[PDB]
Amino acid sequence: KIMKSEVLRVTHELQAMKDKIKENSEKIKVNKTLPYLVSNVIELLDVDPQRKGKCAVIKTSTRQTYFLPVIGLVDAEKLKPGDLVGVNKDSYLILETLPTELDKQIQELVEAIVLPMNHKEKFENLGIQPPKGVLMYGPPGTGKTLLARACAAQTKATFLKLAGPQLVQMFIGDGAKLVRDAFALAKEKAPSIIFIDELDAIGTKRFDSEKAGDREVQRTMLELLNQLDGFQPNTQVKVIAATNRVDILDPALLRSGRLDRKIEFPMPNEEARARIMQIHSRKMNVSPDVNYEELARCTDDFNGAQCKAVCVEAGMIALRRGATELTHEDYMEGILEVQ
Template sequence: MSFEDDVKVGDTNYDDYVIFLKRRIRQLELQVRTLEADKERLERELSRLRMEMSRMKQPPAFAGTLLELLDDERAIVQNFNGPRFVVRIAPWIERDKLKPGSRVALDQRTMAVIELLPSQKDPSVLGFEVIERPKVTYRDIGGLRHQLKELREAVELPLKHPELFERVGIDPPKGVLLYGPPGCGKTLMAKALANEVNATFIRVVGSELVRKYIGEGARLVGELFELAKEKAPTIVFIDEIDAVGAKRMDETTGGEREVNRTLMQLLAEMDGFDPRGNVKIIAATNRPDILDPALLRPGRFDRLIEVPLPDFEGRLEILKVHTRKMNLRDVDLRALAGMTEGASGADLKAIVTEAGMFAIRARREYVTHEDFLKAIDKVLGSEQKLAQQIAIHEVMYG
């Protein structure tokens, strides 16, 4: 006898049983859908693992260099320093990215170009200070109005308005050399310029380009400018360029000859640049008198800009820049500017910082004129030290 014979339709037990069965069916259907989704996910994972295993089983490819494109289907390649081959180019390779000198992966059996590899760079190049866009602006520079105007004409104007030079029919300056005592704002000017033109800023110290082994420094210079082209528009700032650009002598040691090779590579890279291109070179030095004449000739560093110690108005502007966020009380900045003759921009920044430290030591939230007087005495010392700094500047720069 069936359940329907014992329980009549409409009875409470029958209705509850029907509800229970419907609920159970829905639960089973939900479980089936969940299992089907899990099955699809596991099948995709299995397919991915099989593809990964298949790729790992493939023989390794050769790394080579593309020498010449014959047509859309063929190219001449070289495997390291070995023989040259005329090979096919895989159909999935983007032709517009293939250029002579590109690094490519070659099939081990057919030597066909199967992949375009990224350009090789020395880790030292990638370790240089590369700032996509510096945060320094022109407002952060006190004084130096004339120098900043010349720098903007030589670098910013060609990048923003190249059509002006085309209409006049002249080439803009290719490189700019900033020279002057240390701490006067040469690096700050270059960073502010890179911010204004929205350019990548690559800062290199000249001594970083000098290497122990023959040819390493020259290769480093080449890769540096290759990186600059890839990140264009770019401003390459070479600080302390006298470390690699000093005058070449007739009698040299092995180390000096390697420095000269690096210098010659730098000269060649500067000659190979388009003056109207998107890469500009700025260099800075404290010793322009020892630089090689080949660096200073027109076509390389076309514009030489002296960045001197700030005068009274310059010192006053620098003090205003560094104190604009400070809580000052009864501070006479004009008097302080008059007392700091011979101080550089870096000295003035140190004075402002020390004055703030004196206020903090006194548990005050404001800085007084007395704090600045103590800071001047601590940073600059006696009047004899100031006079000595001025004398050194006059001897070096006249």
């Protein structure tokens, strides 16, 4: 063991290094305390001909452009064209980059969002990618908007509102800005839940290509399909879509990353109306007389918002009816009251 006696000096040098890094590692808190302003970063690869080529283009908030190479600590998610980065008074170095900005269905919604995050072990053991796009289509009456948003609130994760008129803006070019923004919060921030609705109305493919806004909504929408079919790593936040009609369905939605789990929900018959309406009345005071037969039959061509309005109208006259519990005939009274 005479040859292994030199290891003690190596360990003394290592512990001496750990004892001497406290100063230069301690000044990080007083030098890199807080960036007082915010500056935008745009990536631009340079070439010097070590003497290696590496630089970046900076843009301050005060509309002043300066020069600085790619510097800082070990970068993993950095080097992207983002904002809200670290900057000192005048050195203008990069130190800290930060991103700027219920009963009848519980299986398909909860699984499709948990398995691409928790079941990675079975993904590595089987080599199978999970489905991404789910299409809650079918005739109206199910209430996919209020029930799908309510179940998205029951997912206990982050929820981001995104509708039709949200992406469609008065100016041009903003659609891709809100797509890269929904991918900023969703893709860049924590995994959130985004539910859009009425995709069939904007998925119109006309023959006369002279006047159709829905084809610019197919430029932003098919640009999202470019950012899903073109971008293989779709393991992050998915795109959940739903339509109220099967009149004009986009044929280019046939992909695992795209809308694959197209679950057909038919007209809300006594069973389905008893399901979504048992959800709508699973907590309120329901008297032991609501057979749901006549009132579930009279709910024809009534969406979940209009059926919720029927529940409100049932919640209107029961005050003056004298009974503190909602009765059977008050549902059909609300139906015949709205229409």
